[PDB]
Structure 1
Amino acid sequence: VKRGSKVRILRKESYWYQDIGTVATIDTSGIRYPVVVRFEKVSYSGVNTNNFSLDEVVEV
């Protein structure tokens, strides 16, 4: 993906699983979860952002 694109989450235990976020940044290091995704809904913890991978994020 690329920064600013809209993505559908595929991590089955995510609060936003099968919901749409927008990509904030993508790390280039050896990070396990390099895609930072922000959402408009808050989770049950009141967090509205999370880190993911590339197999659990699909552009829409």
Structure 2
Amino acid sequence: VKRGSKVRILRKESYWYQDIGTVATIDTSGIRYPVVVRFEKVSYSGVNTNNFSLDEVVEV
């Protein structure tokens, strides 16, 4: 994906699984979860953003 795009979450244990967030940054290092996605809805923890891998995220 790329920064600023709208993405659909495919992590089944995510609060926002199959919801739309937007990508803030993508790391270039050997990071296990580089895609940082921010979400309008807040989780039960109150967090509204999480880091995901590429294979857990699809452009819409």
Q: What TM-score, normalized to structure 1?
A: 0.99
Q: Following the alignment from structure 1 to structure 2, what is the Cα–Cα distance between the partners of residues 31 and 45?
A: 24
Q: Which runs of 5+ in 1 are unaligned?
A: none
- Residues paired across the two proteins, number: 60
Cα distance in structure 1, aligned partners of 2:35 and 2:8: 12
Runs of 4+ deviating beyond 6 Å: none
In 2, Cα distance between equivalents of 1:22 and 1:11:
15
Q: CA deviation at 1:13?
A: 0.1
Q: Which residue of 2 aligns with 1:39?
A: 39
How far apart, in 2, do the equivalents of 1:48 and 1:42 lie?
4
Structure 2: 5+ residue stretches without partners: none
RMSD of the alignment, in Å?
0.2
- Give TM-score, length-normalised by structure 2: 0.99
Residue in 2 that maps onto 1:2:
2
Q: Which has the higher helix share?
A: 2
Q: Deviations over 1:21-56 (max 9, x none)?
A: 000000000000000000000000000000000110
CA drift at 1:11:
0.1
Alpha-carbon distance between aligned partners in 1 of 2:18 and 2:35, rounded to the nearest angstrom: 16
